[PDB]
mmCIF file of C-alpha atoms and ligand atoms in Angstrom:
data_model
loop_
_atom_site.group_PDB
_atom_site.id
_atom_site.type_symbol
_atom_site.label_atom_id
_atom_site.label_comp_id
_atom_site.label_asym_id
_atom_site.label_seq_id
_atom_site.Cartn_x
_atom_site.Cartn_y
_atom_site.Cartn_z
ATOM 1 C CA UNK A 1 171.944 109.334 164.361
ATOM 2 C CA UNK A 2 170.955 110.188 160.783
ATOM 3 C CA UNK A 3 172.434 107.135 158.964
ATOM 4 C CA UNK A 4 169.419 104.702 158.570
ATOM 5 C CA UNK A 5 168.498 103.513 154.999
ATOM 6 C CA UNK A 6 166.000 100.636 155.463
ATOM 7 C CA UNK A 7 164.055 98.810 152.642
ATOM 8 C CA UNK A 8 160.822 96.777 152.348
ATOM 9 C CA UNK A 9 160.551 94.039 149.637
ATOM 10 C CA UNK A 10 157.234 94.143 147.729
ATOM 11 C CA UNK A 11 155.083 91.494 146.063
ATOM 12 C CA UNK A 12 153.698 92.070 142.611
ATOM 13 C CA UNK A 13 150.173 90.718 142.225
ATOM 14 C CA UNK A 14 149.434 90.672 138.485
ATOM 15 C CA UNK A 15 150.895 94.210 137.804
ATOM 16 C CA UNK A 16 147.966 95.759 139.726
ATOM 17 C CA UNK A 17 148.739 95.217 143.429
ATOM 18 C CA UNK A 18 152.138 95.915 145.050
ATOM 19 C CA UNK A 19 152.316 95.165 148.786
ATOM 20 C CA UNK A 20 154.890 94.609 151.521
ATOM 21 C CA UNK A 21 154.976 93.560 155.182
ATOM 22 C CA UNK A 22 154.572 95.641 158.372
ATOM 23 C CA UNK A 23 154.468 94.412 161.978
ATOM 24 C CA UNK A 24 152.069 95.843 164.563
ATOM 25 C CA UNK A 25 152.262 95.291 168.325
ATOM 26 C CA UNK A 26 154.218 93.345 170.968
ATOM 27 C CA UNK A 27 154.795 90.582 169.825
ATOM 28 C CA UNK A 28 154.546 91.783 166.133
ATOM 29 C CA UNK A 29 151.392 90.816 164.186
ATOM 30 C CA UNK A 30 152.266 90.881 160.451
ATOM 31 C CA UNK A 31 150.210 92.463 157.682
ATOM 32 C CA UNK A 32 150.449 92.768 153.874
ATOM 33 C CA UNK A 33 149.982 96.488 153.060
ATOM 34 C CA UNK A 34 149.913 98.914 150.114
ATOM 35 C CA UNK A 35 152.282 101.916 150.554
ATOM 36 C CA UNK A 36 150.169 104.737 149.163
ATOM 37 C CA UNK A 37 151.410 108.260 148.344
ATOM 38 C CA UNK A 38 147.747 109.077 147.532
ATOM 39 C CA UNK A 39 146.617 108.755 151.209
ATOM 40 C CA UNK A 40 148.008 109.607 154.698
ATOM 41 C CA UNK A 41 146.389 107.125 157.103
ATOM 42 C CA UNK A 42 147.595 103.684 158.319
ATOM 43 C CA UNK A 43 144.824 101.001 158.580
ATOM 44 C CA UNK A 44 144.588 97.210 158.976
ATOM 45 C CA UNK A 45 141.453 94.981 159.616
ATOM 46 C CA UNK A 46 140.477 94.554 163.308
ATOM 47 C CA UNK A 47 139.699 91.286 165.196
ATOM 48 C CA UNK A 48 136.507 93.286 166.166
ATOM 49 C CA UNK A 49 135.454 93.104 162.467
ATOM 50 C CA UNK A 50 131.909 91.637 162.226
ATOM 51 C CA UNK A 51 132.335 90.629 154.624
ATOM 52 C CA UNK A 52 135.960 90.784 153.352
ATOM 53 C CA UNK A 53 137.419 90.327 156.923
ATOM 54 C CA UNK A 54 137.162 86.477 156.651
ATOM 55 C CA UNK A 55 139.798 86.523 153.879
ATOM 56 C CA UNK A 56 142.298 88.794 155.721
ATOM 57 C CA UNK A 57 144.681 88.842 158.707
ATOM 58 C CA UNK A 58 143.058 90.676 161.664
ATOM 59 C CA UNK A 59 144.716 92.851 164.297
ATOM 60 C CA UNK A 60 144.014 91.594 167.823
ATOM 61 C CA UNK A 61 144.749 94.410 170.336
ATOM 62 C CA UNK A 62 144.356 91.850 173.206
ATOM 63 C CA UNK A 63 147.512 90.066 171.983
ATOM 64 C CA UNK A 64 149.571 93.311 172.189
ATOM 65 C CA UNK A 65 151.302 94.518 175.334
ATOM 66 C CA UNK A 66 152.278 97.855 173.725
ATOM 67 C CA UNK A 67 148.693 98.747 172.605
ATOM 68 C CA UNK A 68 147.154 102.021 173.916
ATOM 69 C CA UNK A 69 143.385 102.468 173.474
ATOM 70 C CA UNK A 70 141.843 105.499 171.720
ATOM 71 C CA UNK A 71 138.603 104.483 170.002
ATOM 72 C CA UNK A 72 137.944 107.637 167.924
ATOM 73 C CA UNK A 73 135.619 106.519 165.071
ATOM 74 C CA UNK A 74 137.041 106.986 161.567
ATOM 75 C CA UNK A 75 135.889 106.588 157.936
ATOM 76 C CA UNK A 76 138.457 106.255 155.117
ATOM 77 C CA UNK A 77 136.950 106.837 151.660
ATOM 78 C CA UNK A 78 138.958 105.724 148.606
ATOM 79 C CA UNK A 79 138.455 105.924 144.771
ATOM 80 C CA UNK A 80 137.910 102.140 144.925
ATOM 81 C CA UNK A 81 136.036 101.659 148.231
ATOM 82 C CA UNK A 82 135.356 102.839 151.788
ATOM 83 C CA UNK A 83 136.462 101.410 155.149
ATOM 84 C CA UNK A 84 135.376 102.321 158.681
ATOM 85 C CA UNK A 85 136.641 101.607 162.126
ATOM 86 C CA UNK A 86 138.212 103.304 165.126
ATOM 87 C CA UNK A 87 141.682 104.595 166.034
ATOM 88 C CA UNK A 88 144.227 102.703 168.127
ATOM 89 C CA UNK A 89 147.890 103.175 168.920
ATOM 90 C CA UNK A 90 150.726 100.609 168.921
ATOM 91 C CA UNK A 91 154.311 99.993 167.743
ATOM 92 C CA UNK A 92 154.679 99.489 163.944
ATOM 93 C CA UNK A 93 157.815 98.016 162.296
ATOM 94 C CA UNK A 94 158.667 98.980 158.714
ATOM 95 C CA UNK A 95 161.881 97.297 157.518
ATOM 96 C CA UNK A 96 163.772 97.601 160.807
ATOM 97 C CA UNK A 97 162.408 101.020 161.804
ATOM 98 C CA UNK A 98 160.076 100.862 164.846
ATOM 99 C CA UNK A 99 157.584 103.700 165.402
ATOM 100 C CA UNK A 100 154.676 104.433 167.837
ATOM 101 C CA UNK A 101 151.785 105.001 165.473
ATOM 102 C CA UNK A 102 148.142 105.964 165.554
ATOM 103 C CA UNK A 103 146.342 103.762 163.020
ATOM 104 C CA UNK A 104 142.861 102.602 162.188
ATOM 105 C CA UNK A 105 141.490 99.218 163.262
ATOM 106 C CA UNK A 106 138.935 98.564 160.417
ATOM 107 C CA UNK A 107 135.544 96.959 161.451
ATOM 108 C CA UNK A 108 133.676 97.654 158.160
ATOM 109 C CA UNK A 109 135.581 96.168 155.177
ATOM 110 C CA UNK A 110 133.155 95.451 152.232
ATOM 111 C CA UNK A 111 133.561 92.302 150.037
ATOM 112 C CA UNK A 112 133.399 94.774 147.125
ATOM 113 C CA UNK A 113 136.268 95.566 146.486
ATOM 114 C CA UNK A 114 138.309 94.182 149.434
ATOM 115 C CA UNK A 115 137.723 90.501 148.664
ATOM 116 C CA UNK A 116 139.796 91.122 145.489
ATOM 117 C CA UNK A 117 142.614 92.748 147.604
ATOM 118 C CA UNK A 118 145.647 90.450 148.237
ATOM 119 C CA UNK A 119 146.769 92.896 150.932
ATOM 120 C CA UNK A 120 145.228 93.400 154.397
ATOM 121 C CA UNK A 121 145.610 97.181 154.704
ATOM 122 C CA UNK A 122 147.212 100.513 153.706
ATOM 123 C CA UNK A 123 150.193 102.569 154.895
ATOM 124 C CA UNK A 124 149.655 106.142 153.714
ATOM 125 C CA UNK A 125 152.840 107.890 152.466
ATOM 126 C CA UNK A 126 150.982 111.205 151.973
ATOM 127 C CA UNK A 127 151.166 114.383 154.092
ATOM 128 C CA UNK A 128 149.232 115.276 157.318
ATOM 129 C CA UNK A 129 147.174 117.866 155.271
ATOM 130 C CA UNK A 130 145.403 114.818 153.647
ATOM 131 C CA UNK A 131 145.213 112.693 156.871
ATOM 132 C CA UNK A 132 141.718 111.858 158.155
ATOM 133 C CA UNK A 133 141.238 112.828 161.799
ATOM 134 C CA UNK A 134 144.456 114.896 161.417
ATOM 135 C CA UNK A 135 146.382 111.702 162.583
ATOM 136 C CA UNK A 136 150.220 112.111 162.170
ATOM 137 C CA UNK A 137 151.367 109.953 159.152
ATOM 138 C CA UNK A 138 153.952 107.171 159.644
ATOM 139 C CA UNK A 139 156.612 108.925 157.498
ATOM 140 C CA UNK A 140 156.319 112.147 159.621
ATOM 141 C CA UNK A 141 156.928 109.996 162.806
ATOM 142 C CA UNK A 142 159.982 108.326 161.155
ATOM 143 C CA UNK A 143 161.288 111.846 160.280
ATOM 144 C CA UNK A 144 160.798 113.033 163.940
ATOM 145 C CA UNK A 145 163.059 110.134 165.109
ATOM 146 C CA UNK A 146 166.055 111.598 163.205
ATOM 147 C CA UNK A 147 167.249 108.153 162.038
ATOM 148 C CA UNK A 148 167.043 108.509 158.242
ATOM 149 C CA UNK A 149 170.050 109.296 156.059
ATOM 150 C CA UNK A 150 167.725 111.625 154.033
ATOM 151 C CA UNK A 151 164.033 112.672 154.486
ATOM 152 C CA UNK A 152 163.130 110.667 151.400
ATOM 153 C CA UNK A 153 161.523 107.416 150.329
ATOM 154 C CA UNK A 154 161.734 105.627 146.914
ATOM 155 C CA UNK A 155 159.626 103.171 144.941
ATOM 156 C CA UNK A 156 160.672 100.390 142.546
ATOM 157 C CA UNK A 157 157.802 98.373 140.896
ATOM 158 C CA UNK A 158 158.858 95.384 138.789
ATOM 159 C CA UNK A 159 157.109 93.770 135.733
ATOM 160 C CA UNK A 160 155.323 90.428 136.618
ATOM 161 C CA UNK A 161 157.557 87.279 136.184
ATOM 162 C CA UNK A 162 159.800 83.167 138.272
ATOM 163 C CA UNK A 163 161.274 83.947 141.779
ATOM 164 C CA UNK A 164 162.153 87.627 140.957
ATOM 165 C CA UNK A 165 161.692 90.735 143.180
ATOM 166 C CA UNK A 166 158.132 92.162 142.830
ATOM 167 C CA UNK A 167 159.217 95.628 143.972
ATOM 168 C CA UNK A 168 160.968 97.586 146.693
ATOM 169 C CA UNK A 169 160.446 100.630 148.929
ATOM 170 C CA UNK A 170 163.493 102.465 150.285
ATOM 171 C CA UNK A 171 163.098 104.638 153.416
ATOM 172 C CA UNK A 172 165.939 107.161 153.696
ATOM 173 C CA UNK A 173 167.206 107.091 150.098
ATOM 174 C CA UNK A 174 167.138 105.291 146.678
ATOM 175 C CA UNK A 175 168.586 101.899 145.439
ATOM 176 C CA UNK A 176 170.871 102.542 142.399
ATOM 177 C CA UNK A 177 170.581 98.814 141.535
ATOM 178 C CA UNK A 178 166.996 99.627 140.405
ATOM 179 C CA UNK A 179 167.532 102.689 138.263
ATOM 180 C CA UNK A 180 169.762 103.835 135.329
ATOM 181 C CA UNK A 181 171.233 107.299 134.967
ATOM 182 C CA UNK A 182 170.330 110.209 137.166
ATOM 183 C CA UNK A 183 167.172 111.543 138.767
ATOM 184 C CA UNK A 184 165.290 114.507 137.255
ATOM 185 C CA UNK A 185 163.351 116.474 139.899
ATOM 186 C CA UNK A 186 160.055 118.310 139.683
ATOM 187 C CA UNK A 187 158.970 120.471 142.613
ATOM 188 C CA UNK A 188 155.546 119.944 144.187
ATOM 189 C CA UNK A 189 152.936 122.636 143.269
ATOM 190 C CA UNK A 190 152.287 122.976 147.041
ATOM 191 C CA UNK A 191 153.241 120.967 150.123
ATOM 192 C CA UNK A 192 150.546 118.592 151.493
ATOM 193 C CA UNK A 193 150.077 116.631 148.271
ATOM 194 C CA UNK A 194 152.438 114.503 146.065
ATOM 195 C CA UNK A 195 151.229 116.375 143.004
ATOM 196 C CA UNK A 196 153.277 118.064 140.294
ATOM 197 C CA UNK A 197 152.447 120.215 137.252
ATOM 198 C CA UNK A 198 152.168 118.436 133.868
ATOM 199 C CA UNK A 199 152.779 120.499 130.675
ATOM 200 C CA UNK A 200 151.266 118.116 128.088
ATOM 201 C CA UNK A 201 150.404 114.511 127.213
ATOM 202 C CA UNK A 202 151.366 113.487 123.692
ATOM 203 C CA UNK A 203 150.383 110.451 121.527
ATOM 204 C CA UNK A 204 153.215 109.728 119.072
ATOM 205 C CA UNK A 205 155.261 112.911 118.257
ATOM 206 C CA UNK A 206 152.351 115.434 118.610
ATOM 207 C CA UNK A 207 150.776 117.012 121.790
ATOM 208 C CA UNK A 208 147.141 115.934 122.064
ATOM 209 C CA UNK A 209 146.120 116.656 125.717
ATOM 210 C CA UNK A 210 146.991 118.933 128.659
ATOM 211 C CA UNK A 211 148.224 121.703 126.228
ATOM 212 C CA UNK A 212 147.466 124.522 128.690
ATOM 213 C CA UNK A 213 148.929 122.497 131.603
ATOM 214 C CA UNK A 214 147.281 120.162 134.144
ATOM 215 C CA UNK A 215 147.990 118.266 137.378
ATOM 216 C CA UNK A 216 149.622 114.874 137.972
ATOM 217 C CA UNK A 217 149.307 113.078 141.314
ATOM 218 C CA UNK A 218 152.219 110.577 141.650
ATOM 219 C CA UNK A 219 150.211 107.752 143.260
ATOM 220 C CA UNK A 220 151.944 104.561 144.373
ATOM 221 C CA UNK A 221 148.591 103.131 145.472
ATOM 222 C CA UNK A 222 147.003 103.524 141.991
ATOM 223 C CA UNK A 223 147.318 100.487 139.686
ATOM 224 C CA UNK A 224 147.024 102.409 136.451
ATOM 225 C CA UNK A 225 147.674 105.830 134.871
ATOM 226 C CA UNK A 226 144.342 107.717 135.115
ATOM 227 C CA UNK A 227 142.853 110.971 133.871
ATOM 228 C CA UNK A 228 139.475 112.789 133.796
ATOM 229 C CA UNK A 229 136.705 110.925 131.827
ATOM 230 C CA UNK A 230 136.968 113.629 129.078
ATOM 231 C CA UNK A 231 140.794 113.283 128.769
ATOM 232 C CA UNK A 232 140.747 109.471 128.737
ATOM 233 C CA UNK A 233 137.972 109.565 126.015
ATOM 234 C CA UNK A 234 140.230 111.792 123.769
ATOM 235 C CA UNK A 235 143.315 109.614 124.516
ATOM 236 C CA UNK A 236 141.487 106.353 123.791
ATOM 237 C CA UNK A 237 140.116 107.799 120.488
ATOM 238 C CA UNK A 238 143.735 108.717 119.446
ATOM 239 C CA UNK A 239 144.796 105.126 120.314
ATOM 240 C CA UNK A 240 141.800 103.507 118.591
ATOM 241 C CA UNK A 241 140.812 101.723 121.819
ATOM 242 C CA UNK A 242 137.215 100.761 122.589
ATOM 243 C CA UNK A 243 135.299 100.842 125.903
ATOM 244 C CA UNK A 244 134.317 97.472 127.510
ATOM 245 C CA UNK A 245 132.985 98.026 131.086
ATOM 246 C CA UNK A 246 135.336 100.372 133.110
ATOM 247 C CA UNK A 247 138.211 98.916 130.936
ATOM 248 C CA UNK A 248 139.473 100.052 127.534
ATOM 249 C CA UNK A 249 140.550 97.366 124.969
ATOM 250 C CA UNK A 250 142.323 96.891 121.611
ATOM 251 C CA UNK A 251 142.554 93.807 119.388
ATOM 252 C CA UNK A 252 145.618 91.871 120.749
ATOM 253 C CA UNK A 253 147.278 91.844 117.265
ATOM 254 C CA UNK A 254 147.060 95.673 117.105
ATOM 255 C CA UNK A 255 148.666 96.056 120.587
ATOM 256 C CA UNK A 256 152.363 96.051 119.589
ATOM 257 C CA UNK A 257 151.669 98.815 116.987
ATOM 258 C CA UNK A 258 149.938 101.311 119.346
ATOM 259 C CA UNK A 259 151.843 104.655 119.619
ATOM 260 C CA UNK A 260 154.107 105.934 122.410
ATOM 261 C CA UNK A 261 152.436 107.938 125.205
ATOM 262 C CA UNK A 262 154.545 110.847 126.556
ATOM 263 C CA UNK A 263 154.040 112.898 129.813
ATOM 264 C CA UNK A 264 155.795 116.300 129.888
ATOM 265 C CA UNK A 265 156.968 116.780 133.499
ATOM 266 C CA UNK A 266 159.559 119.375 134.509
ATOM 267 C CA UNK A 267 162.274 119.532 131.913
ATOM 268 C CA UNK A 268 161.516 116.332 130.004
ATOM 269 C CA UNK A 269 159.243 113.840 128.350
ATOM 270 C CA UNK A 270 158.513 110.538 130.112
ATOM 271 C CA UNK A 271 157.598 108.010 127.385
ATOM 272 C CA UNK A 272 155.619 104.770 127.685
ATOM 273 C CA UNK A 273 155.709 102.402 124.718
ATOM 274 C CA UNK A 274 152.721 100.021 123.976
ATOM 275 C CA UNK A 275 154.724 97.283 125.931
ATOM 276 C CA UNK A 276 154.391 99.500 129.094
ATOM 277 C CA UNK A 277 150.598 100.139 128.899
ATOM 278 C CA UNK A 278 149.019 97.101 127.088
ATOM 279 C CA UNK A 279 148.475 93.775 128.944
ATOM 280 C CA UNK A 280 149.607 91.753 125.908
ATOM 281 C CA UNK A 281 148.049 88.439 127.038
ATOM 282 C CA UNK A 282 147.675 87.091 123.445
ATOM 283 C CA UNK A 283 148.641 88.294 119.927
ATOM 284 C CA UNK A 284 145.447 86.983 118.222
ATOM 285 C CA UNK A 285 143.340 89.204 115.915
ATOM 286 C CA UNK A 286 140.219 87.576 117.540
ATOM 287 C CA UNK A 287 141.137 88.290 121.211
ATOM 288 C CA UNK A 288 140.846 91.638 123.105
ATOM 289 C CA UNK A 289 143.712 93.152 125.153
ATOM 290 C CA UNK A 290 143.376 95.433 128.230
ATOM 291 C CA UNK A 291 145.122 98.836 128.583
ATOM 292 C CA UNK A 292 146.709 99.842 131.954
ATOM 293 C CA UNK A 293 145.050 103.314 131.579
ATOM 294 C CA UNK A 294 141.559 104.241 132.752
ATOM 295 C CA UNK A 295 139.285 107.187 133.659
ATOM 296 C CA UNK A 296 139.124 108.351 137.302
ATOM 297 C CA UNK A 297 137.406 111.588 138.262
ATOM 298 C CA UNK A 298 139.315 112.538 141.350
ATOM 299 C CA UNK A 299 137.225 114.909 143.501
ATOM 300 C CA UNK A 300 138.590 118.247 144.858
ATOM 301 C CA UNK A 301 140.804 119.455 146.646
ATOM 302 C CA UNK A 302 143.185 116.882 144.995
ATOM 303 C CA UNK A 303 141.301 116.563 141.691
ATOM 304 C CA UNK A 304 140.588 117.150 138.808
ATOM 305 C CA UNK A 305 143.943 115.463 138.195
ATOM 306 C CA UNK A 306 145.785 112.749 136.304
ATOM 307 C CA UNK A 307 147.328 110.044 138.504
ATOM 308 C CA UNK A 308 150.598 108.356 137.608
ATOM 309 C CA UNK A 309 150.155 104.890 139.145
ATOM 310 C CA UNK A 310 151.999 101.535 138.853
ATOM 311 C CA UNK A 311 151.866 101.755 134.997
ATOM 312 C CA UNK A 312 154.113 104.844 135.136
ATOM 313 C CA UNK A 313 156.159 103.795 138.253
ATOM 314 C CA UNK A 314 157.164 100.464 136.619
ATOM 315 C CA UNK A 315 158.885 102.467 133.854
ATOM 316 C CA UNK A 316 160.309 105.252 136.082
ATOM 317 C CA UNK A 317 161.870 104.611 139.504
ATOM 318 C CA UNK A 318 160.399 107.330 141.776
ATOM 319 C CA UNK A 319 161.903 109.271 144.691
ATOM 320 C CA UNK A 320 159.676 111.294 147.053
ATOM 321 C CA UNK A 321 161.718 114.088 148.734
ATOM 322 C CA UNK A 322 160.101 115.558 151.849
ATOM 323 C CA UNK A 323 163.098 117.791 152.692
ATOM 324 C CA UNK A 324 162.933 119.569 149.266
ATOM 325 C CA UNK A 325 159.213 119.023 148.405
ATOM 326 C CA UNK A 326 159.998 117.407 145.098
ATOM 327 C CA UNK A 327 159.635 114.178 143.171
ATOM 328 C CA UNK A 328 162.502 112.571 141.279
ATOM 329 C CA UNK A 329 162.252 110.146 138.352
ATOM 330 C CA UNK A 330 164.938 107.900 136.839
ATOM 331 C CA UNK A 331 164.535 105.036 134.320
ATOM 332 C CA UNK A 332 163.971 101.751 136.179
ATOM 333 C CA UNK A 333 166.092 98.579 135.737
HETATM 334 C C1 0M2 B 401 149.096 98.285 145.257
HETATM 335 C C2 0M2 B 401 148.718 99.545 144.484
HETATM 336 O O1 0M2 B 401 149.634 99.686 143.391
HETATM 337 C C3 0M2 B 401 147.301 99.426 143.880
HETATM 338 N N1 0M2 B 401 146.199 99.038 144.810
HETATM 339 C C4 0M2 B 401 145.662 100.083 145.719
HETATM 340 C C5 0M2 B 401 144.294 99.587 146.101
HETATM 341 C C6 0M2 B 401 143.912 98.608 145.245
HETATM 342 C C7 0M2 B 401 145.022 98.313 144.252
HETATM 343 C C8 0M2 B 401 142.666 97.734 145.367
HETATM 344 C C9 0M2 B 401 142.762 96.382 144.936
HETATM 345 C C10 0M2 B 401 141.709 95.473 145.136
HETATM 346 C C11 0M2 B 401 140.550 95.895 145.808
HETATM 347 C C12 0M2 B 401 140.458 97.208 146.295
HETATM 348 C C13 0M2 B 401 141.517 98.115 146.122
HETATM 349 N N2 0M2 B 401 141.302 99.367 146.609
HETATM 350 C C14 0M2 B 401 142.115 100.105 147.426
HETATM 351 C C15 0M2 B 401 141.442 100.814 148.453
HETATM 352 C C16 0M2 B 401 142.172 101.594 149.351
HETATM 353 C C17 0M2 B 401 143.552 101.768 149.158
HETATM 354 C C18 0M2 B 401 144.230 101.086 148.136
HETATM 355 C C19 0M2 B 401 143.527 100.236 147.252
HETATM 356 C C1 NAG B 402 142.429 109.955 170.822
HETATM 357 O O1 NAG B 402 143.496 110.698 170.211
HETATM 358 C C2 NAG B 402 143.165 112.080 169.967
HETATM 359 C C3 NAG B 402 144.313 112.702 169.201
HETATM 360 O O2 NAG B 402 143.979 114.006 168.725
HETATM 361 C C4 NAG B 402 142.853 112.769 171.295
HETATM 362 O O3 NAG B 402 142.559 114.152 171.108
HETATM 363 C C5 NAG B 402 141.683 112.058 171.973
HETATM 364 O O4 NAG B 402 141.393 112.681 173.222
HETATM 365 C C6 NAG B 402 141.994 110.568 172.155
HETATM 366 N N1 NAG B 402 140.834 109.855 172.666
HETATM 367 C C7 NAG B 402 140.894 108.917 173.636
HETATM 368 C C8 NAG B 402 139.582 108.336 174.062
HETATM 369 O O5 NAG B 402 141.955 108.573 174.155
#
């Protein structure tokens, strides 16, 4: 019956990491995961893990009655780091939906960057076209069940605060308690990737970048808004922000006066004020404040592209429509 509309509560770790809980096996073994529209594979650390594994929950296949062996070796390369392991199959529970899934048991999890990760693994919300080993993604297997009210999933990311809700993922629809107004939809360029066409990025009331059009990957697993090194250099010059490591900074006192950043997607302009992209941790003229925007040279086929991560998602509640191959945005509350 197509009437299921399940949700997973997320935890906000310092506006950079948003993770929820999944259960693997019989009885269920729980894991903190990132739900990533940028990738299409499910992976958690394995009990068979020989640097970062000490700090994370490990999947023990020998404690699962529903486990089915596979063992195909697998390497999952990310913009942040790389993991390796082998494939396994078991039952996975995501907010009351149970699915037989092929996932990766990770045996190579480096302390850089995974020691910094508050989550154990990743649940890829991408398409099979981007899946490593051509492994069927979890959302495709939920679709096949015919339980969902709609072949959609939504993301709400809150601003860090207090016993408030860090975020929420809705499988089968959207939560109108978390958005204002109505959704505006933009069709995907092509199926296989959660990427839409962008028609310009403007600083203030004038179009500075992406004048001849560019790409925007709507990435739930990205912490920040990102662009090509060249684009981010031009943007940061316009903002009067200076480079300090892989971070861009402004003097904390100058933060509240930085201009609005606008992304032209579909029919409209999606605007971020300085309060949306500056980590305003002080207001002193002596201290330096971090911007939630950075350079990221995404390699082909996906890149060169901009990526609208948690910085964007916090402002705009996002709906990912698999039935219509489109992305919807509405102002978040
Ligand atoms: C939660 C989401 O909004 C942002 N996340 C995604 C993510 C982050 C931060 C990260 C944090 C600390 C260390 C490493 C990583 N790298 C990594 C690798 C693979 C897949 C996802 C990640
Ligand atoms: C693992 O799963 C893949 C799925 O394509 C299958 O082709 C392969 O034969 C399986 N391997 C084992 C050892 O079960």
